[PDB]
């Protein structure tokens, strides 16, 4: 007679006291669109939060107002397509995470959770990312 909890402890005390290997995971697991689009959500998520954090903290730590900082940026070679590109890669992460976030919420309702409905939705999210990231870098 042994608890589920008692069994779990014995599983750890035995295996950590052993010379057994862990079978490979990410190094051998075959990649799929949703599998990649899940970390991309973490990426874009973490990246964006870093952007927002860098902004708020510099606004407290760095002197000189925003207007002067902009003029500081103008004071530089800013090729119309190099200000576009340096801006596209600031919308791109946000647009992906925005669209895919919506998909995550449809999921939280419980809809579109079959495998066909997942490749369909993923692609749509992927397209919309491009269109809105190009339609805002051109704004």
């Amino acid at each position: 007679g042994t608890t589920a909890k008692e069994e779990m402890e014995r599983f750890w005390n035995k295996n950590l006291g052993s010379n057994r290997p862990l079978s490979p995971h990410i190094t051998i697991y075959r990649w799929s669109l949703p599998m990649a689009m899940s970390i991309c959500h973490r990426g874009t998520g973490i990246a964006l939060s870093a952007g927002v954090s860098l902004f708020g903290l510099s606004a407290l730590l760095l002197p000189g107002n925003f207007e002067s900082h902009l003029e500081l940026v103008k004071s530089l070679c800013l090729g119309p397509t190099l200000i576009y590109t340096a801006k596209f890669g600031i919308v791109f992460p946000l647009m992906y995470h925005t669209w895919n976030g919506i998909r995550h919420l449809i999921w939280d309702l419980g809809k579109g959770l079959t495998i066909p409905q997942l490749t369909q939705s993923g692609v749509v999210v992927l397209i919309l990312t491009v269109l809105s990231s190009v339609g805002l870098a051109a704004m």
Binding site: M8, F11, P21, S23, I28, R30, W107, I115
Partner: protein
């Protein structure tokens, strides 16, 4: 008329001092073999090498014994037919992020102990009257159980969830989770509220981030994730 296929296979002898996890190649005339990857595994066991160690039983896909990583995906070796494409070398691995006892044989004691913790059996508030009459349940109430009761605890799902890879101790994982839901929507079960109330921590249910590898890999064609979503909804909306 020959026809030969290659098999790269994870190996580990705990009984050979200082053995390191390595692959081993075998070659099989597919004309002398049944269609399935297990057939092959058995055939190399029977003929080429019986140091090869794997779990098997039903060779039919109901016991849940095979359960191994085949060409990147977790399925059942008795269900998966090998690529007749002789140009590809078949890659067989043990179930991901699991302690290898030997070869393709992973310690599932945790996977099992976790299943015990959900209490996967019918529960009544008054069980003084049990064993007397068959309980009533409409063909409708019964339908809510399809796609759930069929799980063969093969562990393909839980063992392809990356959250389970990093949190296998404290996160319950798709198969086990889906089963809790299987008892939640059982009309005859009385403990629905207390079943949910047991998932009230950051780790048990809430490590699922809808990655959806589980549903993606289930050899039995089941949808553990969708069931997890349904639990998440029940958790938010139940009363007390």
């Amino acid at each position: 008329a020959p026809r030969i296929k290659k098999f790269a296979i994870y190996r580990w002898d705990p009984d050979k001092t200082g053995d390191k996890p390595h692959m081993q190649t075998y070659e099989i005339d597919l004309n002398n073999c049944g269609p399935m990857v297990l057939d092959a595994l058995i055939k190399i066991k029977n003929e080429i090498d019986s140091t090869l160690t794997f779990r098997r039983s039903c060779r039919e896909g109901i016991c849940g014994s095979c359960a191994m990583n085949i060409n990147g995906g977790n399925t059942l070796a008795c269900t998966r037919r090998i690529d007749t494409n002789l140009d590809k070398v078949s890659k067989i691995y043990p179930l991901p992020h699991m302690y290898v006892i030997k070869d393709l044989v992973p310690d599932l004691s945790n996977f099992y102990a976790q299943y015990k913790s959900i209490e996967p059996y019918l529960k009544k508030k008054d069980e003084s009257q049990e064993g007397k009459q068959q309980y009533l349940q409409s063909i409708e109430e019964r339908e809510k159980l399809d796609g759930l009761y069929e799980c063969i605890l093969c562990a393909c799902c839980s063992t392809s969830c990356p959250s389970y890879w990093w949190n296998g101790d404290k996160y319950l994982g798709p198969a086990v989770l889906m089963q809790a839901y299987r008892w939640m929507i059982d009309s005859r079960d009385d403990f629905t509220e207390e079943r949910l109330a047991k998932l009230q921590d950051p780790f048990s249910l809430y490590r699922c981030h809808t990655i959806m590898n589980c549903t993606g890999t289930c050899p039995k064609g089941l949808n553990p994730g969708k069931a997890i979503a349904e639990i998440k909804k029940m958790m938010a909306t139940y009363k007390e």
